[PDB]
Amino acid sequence: EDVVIDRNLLILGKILGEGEFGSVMEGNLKQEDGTSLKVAVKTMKDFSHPNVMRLLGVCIEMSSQGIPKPMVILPFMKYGDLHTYLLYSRLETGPKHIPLQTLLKFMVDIALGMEYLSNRNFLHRDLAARNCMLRDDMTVCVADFMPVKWIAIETSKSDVWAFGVTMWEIATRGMTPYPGVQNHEMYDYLLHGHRLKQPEDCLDELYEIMYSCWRTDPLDRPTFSVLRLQLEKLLESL
Numbered sequence: 001e002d003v004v005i006d007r008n009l010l011i012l013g014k015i016l017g018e019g020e021f022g023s024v025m026e027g028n029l030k031q032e033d034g035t036s037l038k039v040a041v042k043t044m045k046d047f048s049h050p051n052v053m054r055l056l057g058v059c060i061e062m063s064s065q066g067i068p069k070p071m072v073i074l075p076f077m078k079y080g081d082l083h084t085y086l087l088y089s090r091l092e093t094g095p096k097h098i099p100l101q102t103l104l105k106f107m108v109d110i111a112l113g114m115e116y117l118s119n120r121n122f123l124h125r126d127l128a129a130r131n132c133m134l135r136d137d138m139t140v141c142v143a144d145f146m147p148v149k150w151i152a153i154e155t156s157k158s159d160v161w162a163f164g165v166t167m168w169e170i171a172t173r174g175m176t177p178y179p180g181v182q183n184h185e186m187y188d189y190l191l192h193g194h195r196l197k198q199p200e201d202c203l204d205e206l207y208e209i210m211y212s213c214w215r216t217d218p219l220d221r222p223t224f225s226v227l228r229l230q231l232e233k234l235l236e237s238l
């Protein structure tokens with residue numbers, strides 16, 4: 001409760017995306033040095049890591065009737081969510097052919113972020129490419145801490161499952177998981193040992209890593225620190 005920002009230091013602009021509890025808006029935050037910073041405002045503070053969304057602060061606006069309007073202030077992510085970015089990469093006017101190297105680097109960043117959170121025994125519970133945001137340096141961070149296709153059958157090993165699905169989203173550059181399978185069918189599909197199929201031109205080594213995330217027994221799944229190194233090692237071999 002010393003995380004608060006004076007509401008007068010904040011100017012709210014147009015809507016950036018729509019969130020669980022309300023709109024996410026662009027804003028300008030006047031900082032302690034007198035300068036103004038572009039921010040995102042949703043209408044965590046202990047976390048410090050480059051691949052994890054930092055909290056800048058909180059403002060409570062007073063409505064006209066006096067009902068609280070709490071707002072969460074986050075850094076501005078020029079390139080928006082990773083899911084949308086991948087989709088745009090498949091179009092001429094959006095970003096170029098993203099090579100394999102850049103796709104793995106997105107995976108490594110996310111693994112680094114999740115390694116940090118899992119080490120502090122913090123569960124994400126909603127990890128997906130749409131919840132991974134892109135910084136202006138094009139490094140990815142993790143954000144947004146019940147979409148059936150990211151949930152594991154049965155902990156941090158649930159998060160590991162979702163990260164594997166996220167790796168698949170990245171490898172496919174934005175395909176919805178499990179084409180030709182409905183949401184109500186998912187439990188039976190998985191219970192019979194079926195998993196996300198290997199993407200088209202994607203290396204066997206990469207597919208082994210993502211597959212290890214979906215082992216039936218969560219104790220057979222690797223930790224985030226194991227995954228991170230496996231991904232780093234794969235990247236270095238290209």
Ligand SMILES: CS(=O)(=O)N1CCO[C@H](c2csc(-c3ccccc3NC(=O)c3ncc[nH]3)n2)C1
Nearest residue numbers: 016017018019040074076077080081131143144
């Ligand atoms: C995953 S989430 O919980 O962060 N979330 C949930 C609601 O939709 C938001 C969203 C979607 S596309 C977008 C965006 C698009 C262009 C430029 C900047 C943008 N956002 C940010 O800079 C920003 N920073 C912190 C949160 N959002 N924002 C993101």
